[PDB]
Scaffold this active site. Structure first.
Site, PDB file in Angstrom:
ATOM      1  N   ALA A   8      14.169  19.428  10.259  1.00  0.00           N
ATOM      2  CA  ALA A   8      13.017  18.607  10.099  1.00  0.00           C
ATOM      3  C   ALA A   8      11.918  18.940  11.117  1.00  0.00           C
ATOM      4  O   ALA A   8      11.189  18.041  11.563  1.00  0.00           O
ATOM      5  CB  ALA A   8      13.447  17.186  10.248  1.00  0.00           C
ATOM      6  N   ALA A   9      11.816  20.203  11.517  1.00  0.00           N
ATOM      7  CA  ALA A   9      10.895  20.580  12.583  1.00  0.00           C
ATOM      8  C   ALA A   9       9.746  21.523  12.131  1.00  0.00           C
ATOM      9  O   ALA A   9       8.967  22.056  12.969  1.00  0.00           O
ATOM     10  CB  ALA A   9      11.667  21.193  13.736  1.00  0.00           C
ATOM     11  N   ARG A  14       1.417  22.128   4.209  1.00  0.00           N
ATOM     12  CA  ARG A  14       1.084  22.014   2.785  1.00  0.00           C
ATOM     13  C   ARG A  14       0.932  20.509   2.347  1.00  0.00           C
ATOM     14  O   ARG A  14       0.266  20.193   1.334  1.00  0.00           O
ATOM     15  CB  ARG A  14       2.123  22.778   1.999  1.00  0.00           C
ATOM     16  CG  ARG A  14       1.805  24.333   1.920  1.00  0.00           C
ATOM     17  CD  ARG A  14       2.906  25.097   1.194  1.00  0.00           C
ATOM     18  NE  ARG A  14       4.199  24.950   1.961  1.00  0.00           N
ATOM     19  CZ  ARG A  14       5.385  25.438   1.541  1.00  0.00           C
ATOM     20  NH1 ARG A  14       5.507  26.035   0.319  1.00  0.00           N
ATOM     21  NH2 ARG A  14       6.466  25.318   2.315  1.00  0.00           N
ATOM     22  N   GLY A 108      15.036  18.208   5.654  1.00  0.00           N
ATOM     23  CA  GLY A 108      14.451  16.873   5.584  1.00  0.00           C
ATOM     24  C   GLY A 108      13.554  16.605   4.386  1.00  0.00           C
ATOM     25  O   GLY A 108      13.134  15.454   4.217  1.00  0.00           O
ATOM     26  N   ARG A 339       0.255 -14.838   1.152  1.00  0.00           N
ATOM     27  CA  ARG A 339       0.267 -14.140   2.422  1.00  0.00           C
ATOM     28  C   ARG A 339       1.506 -14.562   3.172  1.00  0.00           C
ATOM     29  O   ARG A 339       2.149 -15.546   2.775  1.00  0.00           O
ATOM     30  CB  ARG A 339      -0.986 -14.447   3.239  1.00  0.00           C
ATOM     31  CG  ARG A 339      -2.194 -13.681   2.695  1.00  0.00           C
ATOM     32  CD  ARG A 339      -3.439 -14.356   3.190  1.00  0.00           C
ATOM     33  NE  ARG A 339      -3.645 -14.059   4.561  1.00  0.00           N
ATOM     34  CZ  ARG A 339      -4.463 -14.750   5.338  1.00  0.00           C
ATOM     35  NH1 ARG A 339      -5.149 -15.751   4.802  1.00  0.00           N
ATOM     36  NH2 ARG A 339      -4.599 -14.420   6.622  1.00  0.00           N
ATOM     37  N   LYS A 357      -1.232 -19.159   2.723  1.00  0.00           N
ATOM     38  CA  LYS A 357      -0.898 -18.385   3.912  1.00  0.00           C
ATOM     39  C   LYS A 357      -0.107 -19.311   4.837  1.00  0.00           C
ATOM     40  O   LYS A 357      -0.591 -20.436   5.135  1.00  0.00           O
ATOM     41  CB  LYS A 357      -2.188 -17.956   4.651  1.00  0.00           C
ATOM     42  CG  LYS A 357      -1.914 -17.180   6.053  1.00  0.00           C
ATOM     43  CD  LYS A 357      -2.812 -17.942   7.174  1.00  0.00           C
ATOM     44  CE  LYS A 357      -2.483 -17.529   8.595  1.00  0.00           C
ATOM     45  NZ  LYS A 357      -3.435 -18.429   9.429  1.00  0.00           N
ATOM     46  N   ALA A 386      -8.151 -29.314  -7.845  1.00  0.00           N
ATOM     47  CA  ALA A 386      -8.806 -28.022  -7.970  1.00  0.00           C
ATOM     48  C   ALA A 386      -9.893 -27.837  -6.898  1.00  0.00           C
ATOM     49  O   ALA A 386     -10.514 -28.838  -6.434  1.00  0.00           O
ATOM     50  CB  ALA A 386      -9.442 -27.918  -9.355  1.00  0.00           C
TER      51      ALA A 386
HETATM   52  C1  LIG Z   1      13.248  30.458   4.054  1.00  0.00           C
HETATM   53  C2  LIG Z   1      13.815  29.188   3.491  1.00  0.00           C
HETATM   54  O1  LIG Z   1      14.651  28.530   4.088  1.00  0.00           O
HETATM   55  N1  LIG Z   1      13.347  28.826   2.300  1.00  0.00           N
HETATM   56  C3  LIG Z   1      13.935  27.729   1.557  1.00  0.00           C
HETATM   57  C4  LIG Z   1      13.096  26.470   1.736  1.00  0.00           C
HETATM   58  O2  LIG Z   1      11.760  26.721   1.303  1.00  0.00           O
HETATM   59  P1  LIG Z   1      10.532  25.870   1.903  1.00  0.00           P
HETATM   60  O3  LIG Z   1       9.311  26.758   1.928  1.00  0.00           O
HETATM   61  O4  LIG Z   1      10.483  24.542   1.186  1.00  0.00           O
HETATM   62  O5  LIG Z   1      10.995  25.606   3.422  1.00  0.00           O
HETATM   63  P2  LIG Z   1      10.167  24.598   4.365  1.00  0.00           P
HETATM   64  O6  LIG Z   1       8.951  25.327   4.885  1.00  0.00           O
HETATM   65  O7  LIG Z   1      10.003  23.290   3.627  1.00  0.00           O
HETATM   66  O8  LIG Z   1      11.176  24.359   5.596  1.00  0.00           O
HETATM   67  C5  LIG Z   1      12.519  23.943   5.361  1.00  0.00           C
HETATM   68  C6  LIG Z   1      12.815  22.690   6.177  1.00  0.00           C
HETATM   69  O9  LIG Z   1      13.311  23.066   7.466  1.00  0.00           O
HETATM   70  C7  LIG Z   1      12.496  22.550   8.521  1.00  0.00           C
HETATM   71  N2  LIG Z   1      11.960  23.661   9.312  1.00  0.00           N
HETATM   72  C8  LIG Z   1      11.232  24.613   8.721  1.00  0.00           C
HETATM   73  C9  LIG Z   1      10.731  25.659   9.485  1.00  0.00           C
HETATM   74  C10 LIG Z   1      10.992  25.701  10.849  1.00  0.00           C
HETATM   75  O10 LIG Z   1      10.544  26.641  11.540  1.00  0.00           O
HETATM   76  N3  LIG Z   1      11.723  24.740  11.424  1.00  0.00           N
HETATM   77  C11 LIG Z   1      12.210  23.727  10.698  1.00  0.00           C
HETATM   78  O11 LIG Z   1      12.891  22.836  11.251  1.00  0.00           O
HETATM   79  C12 LIG Z   1      11.348  21.776   7.889  1.00  0.00           C
HETATM   80  O12 LIG Z   1      11.413  20.406   8.299  1.00  0.00           O
HETATM   81  C13 LIG Z   1      11.552  21.866   6.387  1.00  0.00           C
HETATM   82  O13 LIG Z   1      11.747  20.551   5.852  1.00  0.00           O
HETATM   83  O14 LIG Z   1      13.655  25.411   0.963  1.00  0.00           O
HETATM   84  C14 LIG Z   1      13.592  25.687  -0.435  1.00  0.00           C
HETATM   85  C15 LIG Z   1      14.052  24.462  -1.216  1.00  0.00           C
HETATM   86  O15 LIG Z   1      13.363  23.303  -0.736  1.00  0.00           O
HETATM   87  C16 LIG Z   1      14.463  26.896  -0.754  1.00  0.00           C
HETATM   88  O16 LIG Z   1      14.344  27.218  -2.144  1.00  0.00           O
HETATM   89  C17 LIG Z   1      14.051  28.101   0.084  1.00  0.00           C
HETATM   90  O17 LIG Z   1      15.021  29.144  -0.070  1.00  0.00           O
HETATM   91  C1  LIG Z   2     -10.322 -21.830   5.443  1.00  0.00           C
HETATM   92  C2  LIG Z   2     -10.744 -21.048   6.658  1.00  0.00           C
HETATM   93  O1  LIG Z   2     -11.537 -21.549   7.474  1.00  0.00           O
HETATM   94  N1  LIG Z   2     -10.214 -19.800   6.783  1.00  0.00           N
HETATM   95  C3  LIG Z   2     -10.486 -18.926   7.948  1.00  0.00           C
HETATM   96  C4  LIG Z   2      -9.120 -18.419   8.479  1.00  0.00           C
HETATM   97  O2  LIG Z   2      -8.391 -17.604   7.521  1.00  0.00           O
HETATM   98  P1  LIG Z   2      -6.846 -17.146   7.755  1.00  0.00           P
HETATM   99  O3  LIG Z   2      -6.439 -17.317   6.315  1.00  0.00           O
HETATM  100  O4  LIG Z   2      -6.187 -18.049   8.854  1.00  0.00           O
HETATM  101  O5  LIG Z   2      -6.778 -15.708   8.203  1.00  0.00           O
HETATM  102  O6  LIG Z   2      -9.367 -17.736   9.733  1.00  0.00           O
HETATM  103  C5  LIG Z   2     -10.269 -16.599   9.669  1.00  0.00           C
HETATM  104  C6  LIG Z   2     -10.477 -16.034  11.079  1.00  0.00           C
HETATM  105  O7  LIG Z   2      -9.288 -15.287  11.358  1.00  0.00           O
HETATM  106  C7  LIG Z   2     -11.592 -16.882   8.940  1.00  0.00           C
HETATM  107  O8  LIG Z   2     -12.179 -15.628   8.575  1.00  0.00           O
HETATM  108  C8  LIG Z   2     -11.471 -17.773   7.691  1.00  0.00           C
HETATM  109  O9  LIG Z   2     -12.782 -18.279   7.371  1.00  0.00           O
HETATM  110  C1  LIG Z   3      -8.634 -30.300 -12.516  1.00  0.00           C
HETATM  111  C2  LIG Z   3      -7.313 -31.019 -12.526  1.00  0.00           C
HETATM  112  O1  LIG Z   3      -7.221 -32.156 -12.032  1.00  0.00           O
HETATM  113  N1  LIG Z   3      -6.269 -30.350 -13.089  1.00  0.00           N
HETATM  114  C3  LIG Z   3      -4.918 -30.941 -13.226  1.00  0.00           C
HETATM  115  C4  LIG Z   3      -4.472 -30.750 -14.699  1.00  0.00           C
HETATM  116  O2  LIG Z   3      -4.348 -29.356 -15.093  1.00  0.00           O
HETATM  117  P1  LIG Z   3      -4.117 -28.898 -16.638  1.00  0.00           P
HETATM  118  O3  LIG Z   3      -5.014 -27.691 -16.553  1.00  0.00           O
HETATM  119  O4  LIG Z   3      -4.498 -30.074 -17.602  1.00  0.00           O
HETATM  120  O5  LIG Z   3      -2.675 -28.524 -16.873  1.00  0.00           O
HETATM  121  O6  LIG Z   3      -3.248 -31.504 -14.885  1.00  0.00           O
HETATM  122  C5  LIG Z   3      -2.135 -31.126 -14.032  1.00  0.00           C
HETATM  123  C6  LIG Z   3      -0.947 -32.056 -14.303  1.00  0.00           C
HETATM  124  O7  LIG Z   3      -0.381 -31.585 -15.531  1.00  0.00           O
HETATM  125  C7  LIG Z   3      -2.488 -31.029 -12.539  1.00  0.00           C
HETATM  126  O8  LIG Z   3      -1.471 -30.259 -11.888  1.00  0.00           O
HETATM  127  C8  LIG Z   3      -3.866 -30.419 -12.232  1.00  0.00           C
HETATM  128  O9  LIG Z   3      -4.221 -30.767 -10.879  1.00  0.00           O
HETATM  129 CO   LIG Z   4      10.550  22.639   1.724  1.00  0.00          CO
HETATM  130 MG   LIG Z   5       4.661  27.629   4.371  1.00  0.00          MG
END
Ligand SMILES: CC(=O)N[C@H]1[C@@H](OP(=O)(O)OP(=O)(O)OC[C@H]2O[C@@H](n3ccc(=O)[nH]c3=O)[C@H](O)[C@@H]2O)O[C@H](CO)[C@@H](O)[C@@H]1O
Ligand SMILES: CC(=O)N[C@H]1[C@@H](OP(=O)(O)O)O[C@H](CO)[C@@H](O)[C@@H]1O
Ligand SMILES: CC(=O)N[C@H]1[C@@H](OP(=O)(O)O)O[C@H](CO)[C@@H](O)[C@@H]1O
Ligand SMILES: [Co+2]
Ligand SMILES: [Mg+2]
Ligand SMILES: CC(=O)N[C@H]1[C@@H](OP(=O)(O)OP(=O)(O)OC[C@H]2O[C@@H](n3ccc(=O)[nH]c3=O)[C@H](O)[C@@H]2O)O[C@H](CO)[C@@H](O)[C@@H]1O
Ligand SMILES: CC(=O)N[C@H]1[C@@H](OP(=O)(O)OP(=O)(O)OC[C@H]2O[C@@H](n3ccc(=O)[nH]c3=O)[C@H](O)[C@@H]2O)O[C@H](CO)[C@@H](O)[C@@H]1O
Ligand SMILES: CC(=O)N[C@H]1[C@@H](OP(=O)(O)O)O[C@H](CO)[C@@H](O)[C@@H]1O
Ligand SMILES: [Co+2]
Ligand SMILES: [Co+2]
Ligand SMILES: [Co+2]
Ligand SMILES: [Mg+2]
Ligand SMILES: [Mg+2]
Lengths: 462, 462, 462
Positions: A8-9, A14, A108, A339, A357, A386
């Site tokens: 992995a070095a 690429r 790797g 959030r 949040k 609402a």
């Molecule tokens: C020369 C060689 O081995 N080629 C093989 C390599 O190609 P490929 O060109 O993919 O080889 P990479 O350049 O990916 O390097 C192989 C892996 O060994 C590590 N690394 C590479 C170079 C280095 O100097 N040090 C190091 O640690 C890298 O993390 C890399 O993940 O894998 C292919 C499949 O994926 C094979 O078909 C290839 O035969």
């Molecule tokens: C309802 C309210 O006042 N929300 C605030 C409040 O949001 P957060 O949801 O706590 O990140 O803090 C913020 C400052 O980090 C501000 O940008 C925003 O106006």
């Molecule tokens: C603006 C308003 O008051 N909307 C209400 C109202 O929404 P509906 O959109 O009718 O399902 O009834 C709900 C109770 O079923 C309540 O959860 C909500 O607060």
């Molecule tokens: Co490779």
């Molecule tokens: Mg190369």
């Protein structure tokens, strides 16, 4: 007995990124995380990760993962990215001089590689007593892969890199996975003979194949038919392709376990997400991080949830939400923003154009329209009118009915069973069963419109 | 003369669902509904549906569909799911002892099967005087299908199920559709000879093929080249695949008739939906149920409409809406929620962050911002100010201009050409051409900020 | 020396549209625009577009494009759509009688055709001294394309149209691109010999191939391996297919340059859009028109931006926006609507359920919730309270803190560092550092609920 090295070095040039390649993600884990998970499961005696220039920024992540997986993972440093053969030399240096187990090598950037594939490799290697066993596969598009060279007898001869191959060798569709098992002594021997006279001027691990063949050692290829498991990622096009393949597989696992997913192609599900039986997921949905959905839920369309817990029989429709919980039977959306720190009780409702949040909302409480709820605790079976604002702690009791267009200027407490009138600004506590009001009375100004908007459509209509 | 049997009595265990398999939906109809629609169109003399354990919950749906399609559809009961051969035995029992027509058999889980395919089957069966004719197709992935066994001469020998097939037979790509025509006497004869000694321990309808061949009867396969028409669904992965294939076909039909669909892959259109010429549908859109869109509309992106009627030249953009009508030329969205019973007149507007429920909104009336309209009737050429709430009947006349932040406390009537001031709580009727107000006058408190927020960024700025 | 003719005078009946075919769009340009862009880049001496019935509605667009590309583009009229051979006759008439350069012909419905393909064609034509060179490709689905007829020796014999081909010729997968180079004298000669005795009763340009072969002239096919570059569009199904292929290519170009695009399939990016390094684009996103995104942005999911400029390190999440600018580090969404003329400063915030139209918002100012801002200028480091309305010029200074539920009745000025209380209707100027208020005081009515809602859940709770 086995040591696994993870290369992995490399610079990762690429990818064209300021984030190290192996830290790019798919399905909620970095590629290096995916590769270390699959290897921890295999549970080898040693696990070494070779890190290079960005090692300062990767090594800590490796240590967190060692903790997480309950095992130690060593880091070997590769000073300059001289090639995959050189990375393996650096890796071996973290082993005792006299180590005698098998050496498994993988990249790797091969992030769908799984424990089973690794196990089978080690079993094949040991069964044929190989000095080296290489995983191969066959691809319609082999661009960028080392090509497998075989003799007339189908014996593996060499691996030729895409940069070094003839136009004709480039048509070869059987590719190197870059996953190997080795006899340690043969590997040490072959590495000391690599030279860097090739088109990349690098020390290629792949040359070890022709070198061991040279010495009449046993060289075995093992064909992986499921190509995805050994696909690599060198650029962002390949990253998104493999992320999409992995996502189809995750979704399929859910569908086979009892989840309806109407549109797999537009449903993105991270690997740790769990989802209950008979849930239906509608198109355009991402379930991310440690999201957990219970059974018989309806989720989507166009919902994104990151670390959200949703009970059974809930609806979460066109919702953007993170780090929040949603109770059994609750209804959220359409057009609802949660959030972090949001907890909505069972049978609760958060409606359209509602943002919450850091608030607790009790069983059966509804906040159905155009409202912001911040830093508030609300009891059970209450109804928030609402177009209201919790202006931010504030505590609202149970069975409260607050009127549309109420502003709650924190901190205030509203007792159980209290009401507020429409258009109230609440600035002090409201007793249980009291009604709080502040809007002035309506006054009608007759014929205002004929006077102040003369000849307007409104004037003619009156 | 023909009787069609539909086998729909299996447990459906591979769906992992508490909803019977044949009730799962795609494109707005259950699989059983799709299959019964295609068969009603063929109009056979008899139509029998074999139902099993969940028959209590499926039979009523079959009776509603018989009514809908204007024909009788009998239900035969299959006590225990002993196999497809046994389901057909149960089905035949709903026919007279002496029935002499053809017997067509198909599954409830083959939902793209169409009237034409069925007709052609019956025509082929009769043309070759077959004792049995079986529909087959050929697939890149034949997993789970009975494989077609042929002799060196391409004569059909047998059907072998996926559970019973050798590794080698499993490579066969030609599959059984599970759709058949039979001579009744030969079918009765072959069924009485089935045994259940196979890997599922079931009575296989498929064995009838080798049994009739045994008796030197004519066995004919008919190859369906469009594999989709005969694809089956045993699990939710296959359900979503076939739903996506069917959706591409529906969308294509619309595009060929004159609808622009920018992104077919993310545009889901139910089978009964109609859409007018030169409409453009933008990505992430679902048109569901009996939705009807006129011509030259713009719909999406990210719009879901279920049972919504939209006139010609309307815009419905990022809208979530059901059971509502939207007039010619009207504009809805972005971010607009329509609940059932919404009727918006021609050239009306419902804007961003507006929800409407059970309300009539007249020609040319605009509700452009952050408002909830519930249980209200509003006239023509009116304008509802931003951030308002109809608190819920209420009637508002024509050419009215209401001010931002008005609460309309039902029930109230606002006459034609009336105005309300910003911040008004309306609790009583407002005459035509009157202005209703209730907000108190503004007062400025000079230097408040230096006094109450001393050293704040606001204090320094003043 | 070369003249390029573009045949764009067919009726386009298979589109089923009242908008001329060649005006339908993909990736933010009409097909005719795409074709003229690729040809201008080739920079031939002459460029002629043949137009037909809808010429009144297309010719002006061609003149705007001639201006845009800095070159003249002539229009030849084709009175009646007698066939592609006849369109070319009409095209030649815009050339001098004695013109002696090469004649390149292409269709207006081949919109991925690029300058390189055209150059290579002209180079091949000249290299083999051909009387005609035709571009061909090979397709899994050749429906609707002229089929390439070759002799046993692989010499091109003829082109047969889909309507005229035998069932057997229809299996030919090598197709005519409809892109040609010609010797002028040979082309004039062959055109005068076309007859219209074929299945469409049209004068086919394609017959010229067999006619020149007749005369023993050199006929060369050039195989284009990337079939997309020469794919045609005769109906809306083919339009969306090629739009999706083109979109994958645009996205891939961005991913290779350093943009993460999580889901290419649901990310639509118009051809002129630019996007900075290490930006991440989340699923369901369209970036349209002249949208420009800087580096390290996060965009989507479910965002549509048309002509929007976004600085570096900004977030624009679930946003629908056009003709607006968003500063470095700014945060927009989720659920945010930007209408034309919106300018949000660096580190500004526009939150959920906020719509802005024609307003300037200064550095570091936040409008986080449920608010409409129209026709307003707001200074720096201000904070607009939730659920507010700019009722529409209005000027608000810097470091202002306005309270939730404030209505700003234009025109009004609020000085630097001023506050408004929650629930204020602002109708006159507010001095710097003043507090403006208008809501009345709260009054609690004790035991109202027991009196007016007796036996209610609220009454019992109190
Ligand atoms: C020369 C060689 O081995 N080629 C093989 C390599 O190609 P490929 O060109 O993919 O080889 P990479 O350049 O990916 O390097 C192989 C892996 O060994 C590590 N690394 C590479 C170079 C280095 O100097 N040090 C190091 O640690 C890298 O993390 C890399 O993940 O894998 C292919 C499949 O994926 C094979 O078909 C290839 O035969
Ligand atoms: C309802 C309210 O006042 N929300 C605030 C409040 O949001 P957060 O949801 O706590 O990140 O803090 C913020 C400052 O980090 C501000 O940008 C925003 O106006
Ligand atoms: C603006 C308003 O008051 N909307 C209400 C109202 O929404 P509906 O959109 O009718 O399902 O009834 C709900 C109770 O079923 C309540 O959860 C909500 O607060
Ligand atoms: Co490779
Ligand atoms: Mg190369
Ligand atoms: C043995 C058999 O027929 N296998 C066929 C069946 O496989 P498959 O395994 O799909 O057969 P299923 O288990 O789906 O059952 C067939 C249908 O008949 C009904 N049913 C099933 C069992 C039962 O005891 N009673 C009953 O009524 C079910 O509703 C089901 O829809 O269809 C496939 C195509 O889809 C064919 O390729 C197989 O050759
Ligand atoms: C007879 C002929 O040429 N057929 C070719 C044409 O088929 P195809 O059937 O697509 O030809 P179209 O009907 O699209 O017409 C070709 C183009 O020329 C213009 N036009 C057409 C007719 C007319 O009378 N006047 C006129 O100016 C139209 O704008 C159209 O864009 O392109 C295909 C590839 O896309 C080729 O495989 C076919 O060999
Ligand atoms: C806050 C406000 O009063 N907004 C008005 C205002 O919106 P615009 O955003 O300027 O188009 O003008 C409209 C008339 O064109 C009217 O429909 C709406 O009520
Ligand atoms: Co089945
Ligand atoms: Co064409
Ligand atoms: Co108010
Ligand atoms: Mg089974
Ligand atoms: Mg035609």
């Amino acid at each position: 007995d086995t040591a696994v090295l993870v290369l992995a070095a490399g610079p990762g040039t690429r990818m064209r990124s300021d984030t190290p390649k192996v830290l790019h993600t798919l399905a909620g884990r970095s590629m290096l995380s995916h590769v270390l998970h699959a290897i921890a499961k295999l549970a080898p005696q040693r696990l070494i990760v070779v890190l290079g220039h960005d090692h300062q920024r990767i090594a800590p992540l490796v240590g967190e993962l060692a903790d997480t997986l309950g095992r130690t993972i060593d880091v070997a440093l590769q000073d300059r990215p001289l090639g995959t053969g050189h990375a393996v030399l650096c890796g071996l240096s973290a082993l005792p001089d006299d180590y005698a187990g098998n050496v498994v090598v993988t990249s790797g950037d091969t992030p769908l590689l799984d424990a089973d594939t690794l196990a089978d490799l080690i079993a094949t290697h040991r069964a044929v007593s190989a000095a080296v066993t290489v995983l191969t596969t066959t691809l319609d598009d082999p661009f960028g892969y080392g090509r497998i060279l075989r003799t007339q007898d189908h014996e593996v001869m060499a691996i030729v890199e895409q940069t070094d191959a003839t136009p004709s060798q480039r048509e070869i569709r059987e590719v190197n996975a870059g996953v190997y098992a080795f006899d340690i002594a043969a590997l040490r021997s072959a590495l000391s003979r690599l030279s860097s006279n090739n088109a990349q001027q690098e020390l290629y691990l792949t040359d070890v194949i022709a070198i061991l063949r040279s010495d009449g050692q046993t060289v075995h290829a093992s064909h992986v038919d499921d190509s995805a498991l050994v696909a690599g990622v060198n650029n962002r096009v390949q990253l998104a392709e493999l992320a999409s393949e992995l996502n189809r597989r995750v979704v399929a696992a859910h569908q086979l376990a009892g989840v309806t997913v109407v549109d797999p192609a537009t449903t993105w599900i991270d690997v740790d997400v769990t989802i209950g039986r008979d849930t239906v997921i509608h198109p355009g949905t991402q379930l991310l991080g440690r999201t957990q959905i219970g059974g018989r839920c309806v989720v989507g369309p166009d919902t994104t949830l990151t670390d959200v817990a949703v009970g059974d029989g809930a609806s979460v429709v066109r919702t953007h939400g993170s780090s929040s919980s949603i109770g059994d039977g609750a209804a959220v959306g359409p057009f609802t923003y949660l959030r972090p720190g949001t907890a909505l009780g069972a049978d609760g409702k958060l409606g359209a154009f509602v943002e919450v949040k850091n608030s607790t909302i009790g069983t059966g409480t509804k906040v159905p329209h155009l409202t912001y709820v911040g830093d508030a605790d609300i009891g059970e079976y209450s109804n928030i009118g609402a177009s209201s604002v919790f202006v931010n702690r504030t505590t609202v009791g149970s069975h409260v009915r607050t009127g549309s267009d109420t502003m709650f200027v924190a901190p205030v407490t509203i007792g159980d069973g209290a009401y507020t009138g429409a258009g109230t600004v609440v600035r002090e506590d409201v007793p249980p069963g009291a009604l709080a009001v502040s809007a002035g009375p309506q006054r009608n100004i007759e014929n205002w419109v004929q006077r102040k908007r003369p000849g307007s459509p409104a004037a003619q209509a009156s």
